[PDB]
Amino acid sequence: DFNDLLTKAINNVNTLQKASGDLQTRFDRGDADVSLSDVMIARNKSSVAFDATVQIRNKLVEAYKDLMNMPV
Amino acid sequence: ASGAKVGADFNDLLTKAINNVNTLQKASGDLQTRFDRGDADVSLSDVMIARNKSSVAFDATVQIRNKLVEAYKDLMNMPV
Amino acid sequence: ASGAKVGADFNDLLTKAINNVNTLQKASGDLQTRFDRGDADVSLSDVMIARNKSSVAFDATVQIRNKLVEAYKDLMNMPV
Amino acid sequence: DFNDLLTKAINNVNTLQKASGDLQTRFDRGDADVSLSDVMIARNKSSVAFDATVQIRNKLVEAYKDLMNMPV
Amino acid sequence: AISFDNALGIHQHTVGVRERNAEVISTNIAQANTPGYKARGLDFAKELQAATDKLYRLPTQPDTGDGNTVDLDLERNLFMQNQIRHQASLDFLGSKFKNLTKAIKGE
Amino acid sequence: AISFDNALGIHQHTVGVRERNAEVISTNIAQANTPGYKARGLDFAKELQAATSGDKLYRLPTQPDTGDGNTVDLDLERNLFMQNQIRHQASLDFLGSKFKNLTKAIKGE
Amino acid sequence: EDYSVTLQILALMTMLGFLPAMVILMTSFTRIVVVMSILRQAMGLQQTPSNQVIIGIALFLTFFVMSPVLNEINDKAVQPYLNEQVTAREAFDAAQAPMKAFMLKQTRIKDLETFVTMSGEQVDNPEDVSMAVLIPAFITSELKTAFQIGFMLFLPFLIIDLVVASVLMAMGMMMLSPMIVSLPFKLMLFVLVDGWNLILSTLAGSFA
Amino acid sequence: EDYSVTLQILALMTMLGFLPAMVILMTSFTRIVVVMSILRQAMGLQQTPSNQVIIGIALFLTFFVMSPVLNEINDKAVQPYLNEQVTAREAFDAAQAPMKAFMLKQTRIKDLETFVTMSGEQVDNPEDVSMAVLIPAFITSELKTAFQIGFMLFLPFLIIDLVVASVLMAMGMMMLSPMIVSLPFKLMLFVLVDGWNLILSTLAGSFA
Amino acid sequence: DYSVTLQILALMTMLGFLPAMVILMTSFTRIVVVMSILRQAMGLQQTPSNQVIIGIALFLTFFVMSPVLNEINDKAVQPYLNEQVTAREAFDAAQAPMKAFMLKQTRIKDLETFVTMSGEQVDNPEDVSMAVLIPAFITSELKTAFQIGFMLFLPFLIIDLVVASVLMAMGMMMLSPMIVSLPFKLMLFVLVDGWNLILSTLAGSFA
Amino acid sequence: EDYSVTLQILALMTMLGFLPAMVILMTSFTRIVVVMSILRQAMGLQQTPSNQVIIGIALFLTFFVMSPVLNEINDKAVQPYLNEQVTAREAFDAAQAPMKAFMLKQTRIKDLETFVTMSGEQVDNPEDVSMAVLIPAFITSELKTAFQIGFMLFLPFLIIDLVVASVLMAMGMMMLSPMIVSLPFKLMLFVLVDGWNLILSTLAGSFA
Amino acid sequence: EDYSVTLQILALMTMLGFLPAMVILMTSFTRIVVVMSILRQAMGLQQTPSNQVIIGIALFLTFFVMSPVLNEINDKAVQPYLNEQVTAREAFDAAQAPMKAFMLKQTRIKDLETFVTMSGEQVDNPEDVSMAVLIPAFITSELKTAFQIGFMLFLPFLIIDLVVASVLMAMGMMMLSPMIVSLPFKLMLFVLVDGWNLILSTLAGSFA
Amino acid sequence: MTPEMFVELFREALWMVLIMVCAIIIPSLLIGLIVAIFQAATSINEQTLSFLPRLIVTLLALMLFGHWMTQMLMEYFYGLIERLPQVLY
Amino acid sequence: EYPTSVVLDWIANYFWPYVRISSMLMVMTVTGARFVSPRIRLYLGLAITFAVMPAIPAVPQDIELLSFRGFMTIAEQMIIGIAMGMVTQFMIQTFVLLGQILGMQSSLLLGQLFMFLTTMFFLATDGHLKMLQLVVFSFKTLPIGSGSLNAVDFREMAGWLGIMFQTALSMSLSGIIALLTINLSFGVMTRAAPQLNIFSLGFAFALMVGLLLCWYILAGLYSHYEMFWTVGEAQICRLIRL
């Protein structure tokens, strides 16, 4: 179930990024039924989610390097 | 003067500061949401004062955590 | 002459600077609250001068503190 | 092959750097057929590519150093 | 020590009083034409005591049958002074947190 | 060699003179309205020479005074103060880079 | 009163910082590394298995034996927390309980008695000690258990070393080094007995 | 569905960090490294080939023996990926299959059986086991296979040492160390047999 | 008193000196040295690992020095949070419980040596300044740790001498005794319940 | 379209990063170091010359013997590059060509044959082989050549050791260790033959 | 023209990094350690003096014998540089020359000829040869000189051991090892003649 | 404490290993003499003959004195541990 | 005042005395041991320098911290510290020499037994305190600014190898004669029958007596250590010119 937990979190981050890019493309194309607030809200959610993804990855990699470099 | 007694005492001291920070953040959030929803008897000064307090309180929480984590890493990574 | 005299002279230099910074901070605080309470003998120009000097004085205090800590952190990471 | 992959990747980097440099010189010398947006898109395009090839090189060297610094 | 009450001083309360004072002056100007309305003044020291009221203004000239004791020359000047002092209180109280954050973060 | 004088150069004395000049220029601006006050000038070359190893200059007015006797041309004072601040910023950058390069060499970072 | 979202993020981001400490103290990583470290010293090869490979196999082993506790944490604490069934503190307590059960299962009484007396708290049952006093008692128990396992594995190689050294002395060639003439036989014994499978199986078996 | 460009870079940059781990666990680097250490121990010189040279030869050889796998990775995964014929999901799975196939071919059933029962998963055929259960099994089999090859090379040098030790003892000199006398002949045996070409060719040929 | 902005800066700065305070004022020093000496006693070089050695010492230095933390809390932390005491007085109120603990855990001879070296005239041992007590404390604790640690070394040296002489008795002069003694060195430590015996005495050694 | 200045610097900084690898694999450093190692173990002295001095001597020797190829790189790849006469890509090829030629003069055709088949590339002429294949072939040839020279120098010291042991056994003093008495004669022979100047001259002349 | 303060600092730190090399390749450290290595090897003690004190005594001995050259560097180079009498470039050359002169006083003509031909350069005076070529010739002469002294030091201990062995054999006890009896006699004769003081005179004064 | 007390500790430890080594070796020394005198009486000159008999009794002695040597090492460790107060006082 | 003078002097007045103190610790017998971490040793050197600061005279202000003359000052402070440290290593290793000569003569790790006991002698006799008193006295009679080890100091310190053998032989001469005479007596007494010989039988006999003689050596070793320490302490005072 831990494999499911990791993929579900990544899928949530990937889903937020797709929504952010989708609204930016629609807004930049000139679609009338798009508000700048929704675009800014969407891209801020994507930025926070991706920042979490990077920091969690850095923590796990730092944890991995500490264990592997331990003198047995 | 027992290990469990002092461990509880510093835990009580530590959890009191955490609760104090949590109180400031909840109060700041409560003032923001009442003013934002349209309540007439909420002044912008009270909203701005509370959210400035929470930012300072949370900034201290992060900085104190960094000092403790660095101190822990310093003692664990020392070349014994 | 001994090395303690140099150490004491350095200690008095730091204590004098801290007192000078503390004196400015308290002086600015009184002038701020004197003008804020509504005293008519206090000029806004003097208040802004007072808090300008205290802010600069404290900023100098922060810079010296960071250099002292960085030197100590540099010192502890040395072969011995 | 993997060798040709490494070779193509670098030739992509200098092509972006060569194109970015040419646009910078044309705009700087006062040519009226070069727009600032073209320069900025191109120069940011090469900056990401050169940062990527620096990071990839750094990771490969770290891997080499780790492998060679193990007792055999 | 080291508490928000002492770190902020009385600048946390002055901003509120300057808002209340501005409200009362706005009421006086609006109610200048309505007969029978008595101009209301706010005592600064009272809200100072409340931190650590809503009085009446005696006219300098007689009424003209309305009974309204609002002098629009006075109200405009008192509203201008309150607005200027309100901005200074924001500057004072705003810099309290800016110095406080710089002490904690060290940068 | 390997000394702070030979390393910092004249960028340590120049900063002090530029701050001295700003004190003189600000004095003229503040004393612009005082009648009888004469504008004060500062010689950079002489001050730098004195600082490196170690009198009153007055500024000739462009136009006669209106009776008060003050020879402070506030149009010129602002222009000189603006120039002094720019050259002082360069001197701090020049002097600041001297310490950074010295630290870089003594640590190889 | 549940903590704010900002504090909860800051709270579990700190757990990642202490993650290496949990592995080396509260998990099975300590015993597995020690046993394989002593096993390496038992054979003639000094550093042939290498530290990184030893840690790599240990990480896979400690992941497989801690799966029931990890699954229990997810199915008791993580899922209710994600589904808004319990608060942050209840989720934290629900996650700690299976971890405490694992350490208490593989510990020694005398080690628990030693630490409860020094701390100075009343104890009447094993399942009342704070985690602050269980961690040092658990690692001490693991080190003793690891040493006992390492001793058993060392003995068969010691027998070979004594035999081959005595046989050379029987012919009278004292200058010939027993260590060089014993390494092929030590390695071969580890092969036909298939040590790399049963020893890891015993380490997995010893925790359950 | 398909991972965003930012996430694809993050995953790729992550694998570069684990590149040293994949070399010593998922490739032929470990077996070749172990064999040379045993071969060096068999001869009298303990640090003459030098660690840096041995790892350097191991890196060159592991590049030659993993070339069929790498080319399959390039053809199956990278080329459809760079031409936008498969998504990022399919490309990563298509890259994993040839690497998994290589590790499955060099593993042992018992080692796979040991970790499958340890992982607690229901596996019907070996050719579909999870990656997390194959890596510990593959490195386990490589270490065992390395010991068998090392024992083969140790015997000829051991025989020379035994022969010269007994000849010296026959003539009555029980104080002369056979190791000094045996060393020139140990080196010569590795020379006229062309050892540095024979050993490396067998190690490369041991994965076919 | 110092301004609010300055006294926040003071506690923040010394918050980063917490590792410094632990190493040279509390019982962290003696336990680590004894742990390190005992680690070298057995044939294993880094099997206990540095992190585990430190982790045990950190738990021990909290249980043993728990009375010190209790007095500091109730005499310095509590009065300061109730505004019953100022910043400097609270800091001085914390030094006294820790200075008393360090003074009683040192050797007279070392303090006599250090007061002579410091060049200050003090008539009685209990009035020495903390500037000279800190080096005197660690110097004495180092001697105590070395004396305690090497006595633990002796039983493991006994095994080495016995096995080495036995191997030399049969003419097996080439067999290294260290690899033969290693299994028996571990057994001696586990039979006597070493990991509990040393810690119990180390905890009871302080006062 | 030569590489841009930023990429040219990035390439050169990478080559300095692999400088120990270039010296220990692509140069004469390995053969000199191994021959010195065999000679040191040939005599009774274990590590009297010390490791730093041995490497220090080898570094100067490997710089002198490779001065011709170093100059050829300078005269054909560096000076034209600095004088703005050759494309940076061409200059890199002009520097690599003399290095490849030198490595081919000191390699064995058997080493090339096994590595070319190992790489699985269809190349016939023994001059257009890749550096990926040439370097392992070169270092393998250097190790084998060093063993041959090491055996050559070992024989006279073996002769002295056997004579001293035989003479001592002739007098019936079997208890006396031959090694303690043999060593001064080993120093004696090596010094009146002017060994240090002789061996370094032969090692310098060997690379041809 | 003269190097800037920033660049002079960089050069100073660089020479400090190479300081261990200058001790063991340019000063008298190599000869002293090799000679002291023979003395430890000659007596029955294997590691009894231990490596630490030998290096420490060697370092102090070098500072004693390098004191004339170090003072000559101090006077000629450091003093004008500190007083800002001369530039950094000429001060560095003024410091290099005394080291070159000292290395010439401890080298042989044959050694210089071999390396100057090896470097493939043109020179007519030994006084202006590059220090890059003088260093390998210096240590090569040092190693040969140290072996000569060590051989002379080894003879008296060989003399004592052979006498004791002959006496024991002549008395008929063909069963007792000469080493145990001879060791006190070698140590007693090393003390009552004050052997180390004699070795100091013939080692420190050997340079001149 | 005092250096003399440390000398007493080290002499006591060396005394114990003398008892340990004597119990193991003496059974082998007696057998070595018995075989050697038997060879001398019978004019037998096989020098390597009396190795296995010494090895057999040495291994037998280790098995026979297994309990005693254990009890003695453990009690010595306890004796030192209970003597730690001497150091602290 | 210009603040440069105040701050620079304290760093010069602290680090330079500390360097000599720290350099002695890293070469010292106890503080330079492998058991103690560098961090604990670093704090010990920092604490000792701060405490003994009043007894340290003010360093000359002529030499600048950033100058080649100041760089030489740092190096010559270490040389003084290493000189004291090597003397302590000389004594302990001489006892290690005493242990191994007895072990070698005992037909046989015995150096470690003497090394540990000699370390106890160093700690019990407050040898570490005396060394710390010596280094602070070195500041008085051998000032930081003008002063360094001369050539004669190097030669005296290089001559300590003869001190090792003479002292080690003097301690073991009585025991080594006992070891030889019993082995020679055993050889001659059993030489009547060449069938017995000794070989491994002689190995067992020699080692039992050798361990017994080491028991005698430890009985009277303390007096030899006291005389040895006096010789070593006199050498240290000669280095610091006290």
Give the 3-state secondary structure of residue F57: strand
Residue F66 has what DSSP assignment?
S
Say yes or no for a CB contact (<8 Å) between I54 and B1.
no
Minimum Cα–Cα distance from B27: chain G residue = G4
Say if CB J190 and CB J72 are below 8 A apart. Answer: no
Contacts 24+ apart (CB under 8 A), J111-114: J111/H196, J111/H197, J111/J136, J111/J137, J111/J138, J111/J140, J111/J141, J112/J137, J114/H197, J114/H200, J114/H201
CB neighbours (10 Å) of residue F7? 21
Q: Which of M229, M49, M16 is nearest to M136 (CA)?
A: M49
H runs (alpha helix) in chain L: 3-42, 52-64, 66-82, 84-88
Half-sphere exposure of J129 (CA within 13 A, CB side): 30
| DSSP string across J44-66 | S-SSSS-HHHHHHHHHHHHHHHT
Say yes or no for a CB contact (<8 Å) between H6 and A50.
yes
Residue F40 has what DSSP assignment?
E
CB neighbours (10 Å) of residue M172? 24
What is the maximal distance between C-alpha atoms in chain C?
64
Q: Which of H76, H114, H109 is nearest to H95 (CA)?
A: H76
d(CA J68, CA J204): 13
Say yes or no for a CB contact (<8 Å) between I165 and L28.
no
CA B40 remoteness from chain centre: 29
* Neighbouring-strand partners of residue F40: F58
Tokens of E53: 């009221």
CA H18 remoteness from chain centre: 17
d(CA K57, CA M156): 10
Q: Which of J124, J123, J86, J111 is nearest to J8 (CA)?
A: J86
Say yes or no for a CB contact (<8 Å) between H10 and A68.
no
Sign of CA dihedral L59, L60, L62, L67: positive
d(CA F25, CA F42): 9
Q: Which residue has the tokens 């309470």?
A: C37
Which helix or strand (DSSP H or E) is residue E41 part of? Answer: strand E40-41
Give the 3-state secondary structure of residue E40: strand
Burial of residue J7 (CB within 10 Å: 0-12, 13-18, 19+) is middle
Instruction: Report the b/e string of J146-166 with b at 16+ CB within 10 A.
Output: bbebbbebbeebbebbbebbe
Our separate counts of H helices and E strands in chain J read 11, 0
Q: What phi and psi values does residue K104 have, to the nearest 5 degrees?
A: -70, -35
Say if CB I103 and CB I125 are below 8 A apart. Answer: yes
CB neighbours (10 Å) of residue M75? 12
F97 in contact with K at a CB cutoff of 8 Å? no
Question: Which residues of chain H are within 8 Å of residue D67 when distances are taken between CB atoms?
Answer: 20, 23-24, 29, 55, 59
d(CA K99, CA H159): 53
Sign of CA dihedral I91, I94, I95, I96: positive
d(CA M234, CA M87): 11
**What angle (nearest 5°) sits at the alpha carbon of residue D51, between those of residues D47 and D56?**
150
* Distances I66 to B3, B9, B69, G120 between C-alpha atoms, Å: 5, 11, 22, 10
Q: What phi and psi values does residue M56 have, to the nearest 5 degrees?
A: -85, 125
d(CA H123, CA H120): 9
Method of structure determination: cryo-EM
Q: Which of M128, I149, I35 is nearest to L84 (CA)?
A: I149
Q: Which of G52, G173, G187 sits opposite H147 (nearest CB)?
A: G187
Say if CB H26 and CB H103 are below 8 A apart. Answer: yes
d(CA G38, CA G147): 8
Interface test with M, best of L1, L2, L4, L7 (most M CBs within 10 A): L7
Question: Which residues of chain E are within 8 Å of residue C59 when distances are taken between CB atoms?
Answer: 102
Say yes or no for a CB contact (<8 Å) between G24 and A70.
yes
- The total number of residues shown for chain H amounts to 208
Say yes or no for a CB contact (<8 Å) between G181 and H175.
no
Q: What phi and psi values does residue J34 have, to the nearest 5 degrees?
A: -70, -45
Say if CB E1 and CB I7 are below 8 A apart. Answer: yes
Q: Which of L55, L46, L70, L49 is nearest to L24 (CA)?
A: L55
User: J106: Cβ–Cβ under 8 A, 6 or more apart, which residues?
Assistant: J28, J138, J141, J142, J145, J207
Tell me the nearest-neighbour CA distance from G30 into chain A, angstroms.
10
Tell me the nearest-neighbour CA distance from I55 into chain L, angstroms.
23
Q: Which of M47, M129, M200 sits opposite I171 (nearest CB)?
A: M200
Question: Which residues of chain G are within 8 Å of residue A70 when distances are taken between CB atoms?
Answer: 24, 51, 55
Tell me the nearest-neighbour CA distance from F9 into chain K, angstroms.
11
Tell me the nearest-neighbour CA distance from L73 into chain M, angstroms.
17
* Neighbouring-strand partners of residue E40: E56
Burial of residue E73 (CB within 10 Å: 0-12, 13-18, 19+) is exposed
Give the 3-state secondary structure of residue E56: strand
Residues 40-79 of B with CB under 8 A from M: 78-79
Say yes or no for a CB contact (<8 Å) between D17 and J4.
yes
d(CA B42, CA B26): 16
H19 in contact with A at a CB cutoff of 8 Å? no
Question: Which residues of chain K are within 8 Å of residue M95 when distances are taken between CB atoms?
Answer: none
Tell me the nearest-neighbour CA distance from K129 into chain J, angstroms.
15
CB neighbours (10 Å) of residue M62? 8
Give the 3-state secondary structure of residue F58: strand
F108 in contact with K at a CB cutoff of 8 Å? yes
B near H: at least 3 beta-carbon pairs less than 8 Å apart: no
J neighbours by CB contacts (3+ pairs under 8 Å): D, H, K
Say if CB H120 and CB H112 are below 8 A apart. Answer: no
Q: Which of I205, I174, L6 is nearest to I197 (CA)?
A: I205
I113 in contact with M at a CB cutoff of 8 Å? yes
Say if CB M59 and CB I43 are below 8 A apart. Answer: no
H runs (alpha helix) in chain H: 5-17, 19-26, 29-42, 51-65, 67-73, 79-82, 88-105, 109-119, 131-170, 178-192, 195-205
Resolution (A): 3.2
d(CA K164, CA K149): 24
E near F: at least 3 beta-carbon pairs less than 8 Å apart: no
CB neighbours (10 Å) of residue G46? 12
G53 in contact with D at a CB cutoff of 8 Å? no
CA C12 remoteness from chain centre: 14
Question: Which residues of chain G are within 8 Å of residue A72 when distances are taken between CB atoms?
Answer: 33, 36-37, 51, 54-55
d(CA M200, CA L51): 8
* Neighbouring-strand partners of residue F41: F57
d(CA I29, CA I36): 11
- By a Cβ cutoff of 8 Å, what residues of chain B touch chain I? 1-3, 5-7, 9-10, 13, 63-64, 67-68, 70-71, 74-76, 78-80
Give the 3-state secondary structure of residue H9: helix
* Distances I51 to A71, G102, I37 between C-alpha atoms, Å: 10, 22, 16
Q: Where are the beta strands (DSSP E) in chain F?
A: 40-41, 57-58
Interface test with M, best of C5, C6, C16 (most M CBs within 10 A): C6
Half-sphere exposure of A61 (CA within 13 A, CB side): 15
Which helix or strand (DSSP H or E) is residue E55 part of? Answer: strand E55-56
Tokens of J71: 């100059």
Q: Which of I64, M122, I206, I38 is nearest to L80 (CA)?
A: I38
Tokens of J48: 């009297």
Burial of residue D52 (CB within 10 Å: 0-12, 13-18, 19+) is middle
Tell me the nearest-neighbour CA distance from G43 into chain D, angstroms.
16
Q: Which of G53, G67, G196 sits opposite H120 (nearest CB)?
A: G67
Q: Which of I6, I13, I16 sits opposite C25 (nearest CB)?
A: I6
Minimum Cα–Cα distance from M112: chain I residue = I157
Q: Which residue has the tokens 């034209």?
A: J80
Residue J4 has what DSSP assignment?
P
H runs (alpha helix) in E9-71: 11-30, 44-51
| DSSP string across C17-75 | HHHHHHHHHHHHHHHHHHHHHT-TT--HHHHHHHHHHHHHHHHHHHHHHHHHHHHHHHH
Question: Which residues of chain M are within 8 Å of residue B79 when distances are taken between CB atoms?
Answer: 37-39
Which helix or strand (DSSP H or E) is residue K140 part of? Answer: helix K131-170
Question: Which residues of chain M are within 8 Å of residue L18 when distances are taken between CB atoms?
Answer: 208, 211-212, 215
Q: Which of I150, B27, H140, K35 is nearest to G57 (CA)?
A: H140
d(CA J151, CA A51): 63
G38 in contact with A at a CB cutoff of 8 Å? no
Say if CB I46 and CB I184 are below 8 A apart. Answer: no
Say yes or no for a CB contact (<8 Å) between F6 and K9.
no
Tell me the nearest-neighbour CA distance from I120 into chain C, angstroms.
12
Interface test with H, best of D8, D57, D60, D72 (most H CBs within 10 A): D72
C neighbours by CB contacts (3+ pairs under 8 Å): E, I, M
d(CA I175, CA D34): 83
Instruction: Report the b/e string of K75-110 with b at 16+ CB within 10 A.
Output: ebbbeebbeeebebeebbebbeebbbebbeebbbee
Interface test with H, best of D67, D68, D69, D70 (most H CBs within 10 A): D67
d(CA I12, CA D18): 51
d(CA M64, CA C31): 45
Give the 3-state secondary structure of residue H18: coil
Minimum Cα–Cα distance from C75: chain M residue = M42
Q: What phi and psi values does residue B39 have, to the nearest 5 degrees?
A: -60, 130
